[PDB]
Design an enzyme around this catalytic site. Sequence first.
Site, mmCIF file in Angstrom:
data_model
loop_
_atom_site.group_PDB
_atom_site.id
_atom_site.type_symbol
_atom_site.label_atom_id
_atom_site.label_comp_id
_atom_site.label_asym_id
_atom_site.label_seq_id
_atom_site.Cartn_x
_atom_site.Cartn_y
_atom_site.Cartn_z
ATOM 1 N N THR A 51 3.125 2.766 -33.750
ATOM 2 C CA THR A 51 4.516 2.941 -33.353
ATOM 3 C C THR A 51 5.342 1.713 -33.710
ATOM 4 O OG1 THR A 51 3.884 4.370 -31.491
ATOM 5 C CG2 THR A 51 6.099 3.428 -31.452
ATOM 6 N N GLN A 52 6.462 1.932 -34.399
ATOM 7 C CA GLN A 52 7.378 0.850 -34.728
ATOM 8 C C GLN A 52 8.575 0.773 -33.791
ATOM 9 O OE1 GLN A 52 6.461 -1.357 -37.000
ATOM 10 N NE2 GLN A 52 4.640 -0.124 -37.445
#
Lengths: 231, 232
Positions: B1-2
Amino acid sequence: NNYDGDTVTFSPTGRLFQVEYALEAIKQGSVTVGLRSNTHAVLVALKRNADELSSYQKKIIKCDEHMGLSLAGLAPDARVLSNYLRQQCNYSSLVFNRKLAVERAGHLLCDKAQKNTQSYGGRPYGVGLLIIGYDKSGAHLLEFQPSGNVTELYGTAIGARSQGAKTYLERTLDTFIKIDGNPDELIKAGVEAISQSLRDESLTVDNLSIAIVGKDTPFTIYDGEAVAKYI
Amino acid sequence: TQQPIVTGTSVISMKYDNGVIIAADNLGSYGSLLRFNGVERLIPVGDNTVVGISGDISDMQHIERLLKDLVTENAYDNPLADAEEALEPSYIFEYLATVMYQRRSKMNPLWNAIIVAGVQSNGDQFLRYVNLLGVTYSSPTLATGFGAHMANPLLRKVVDRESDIPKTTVQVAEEAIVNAMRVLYYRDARSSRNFSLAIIDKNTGLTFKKNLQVENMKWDFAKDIKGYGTQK
């Protein structure tokens, strides 16, 4: 015999001859005995030397603080399996902060042995193993054969002429079962059991090795003068 | 996840003389929109462990799947699965921390903060924290995110040192937890009135209470507040 060329060939009766030859390799090894009580587990090993000027071959390998084994047969195969077991115990400790159970290690050895008897290009291992340990369920002893079979027992013996020691252990089962809190007595029982497989030699400080694990005892190996009091 | 998308708020927890208590609200927010109501963020793993998760909801569901897989794998070829070979809070936390740190090392983190609470086999309480960077720590009281700024000061009033743990009963600890939840609902804009609580005790079993609502609040004095400064 045209069916003994490789490990992927069944015989007309359904036998794997390479596995049987590996078992024969085991049967020519030096006798080792494993024993346990509700609090401790013990390995007794008779070493062998090439000649008088030679040292004696080591037979007991420590896998982890709570686990170890003794070998009978082809020693490099024992080294390979012991390294695999050390890696698995280290992985369990590192990832789960957990001490690997003895039964799970037996399962892992069974799975690793099975893959070498079903595919071309690889031979089965040529060693039998007696594995002792202490975990949250108490003391455990396991016997491993290179066919993949692993059994949990109160006591056993493998190697040449191990039948006498096995008979002695089977006769005196109820005695050594209840040797709790007295490690020396259990070690002496194991030494007496391994004395039943000797024919033309006597136990000395050079050819006798002992290992013990227990409730408060890490896996420890005695050899040389450290076994002089058990002879 | 960014970057998180759907996020849950703080999880709060404290240790008392016999066990541990943990709590978290049931809201999944979507960038200042209070989108999803009824999201359970406390996951009981067995009978001696509860995992409370804050942050991205999708990563939370992934973690729930991982925990269920871990339980199933532990049950394999283990006749003592409901015995001395059952999973322990220490095992679960070590596994989760390993996962978090490994995923951080790959620049693909699980955007979460996790509190593992429970009771060991010997009876000792367990309470530890690990976040998306893999940073881990333990304390007599734990809280992440917004709660870490408001729940911790209140809870540390009850249990300020390790020596205060044996003096703290379950009733006092639960009252403190409920009051902290009410304060968070007062002052956290991403919070909900509905929450869930879990008590893990060494003598009694796991008690999981759902559909708990923040009780009687103080709003009457608002009628006395006139316009800013000089009005009226």
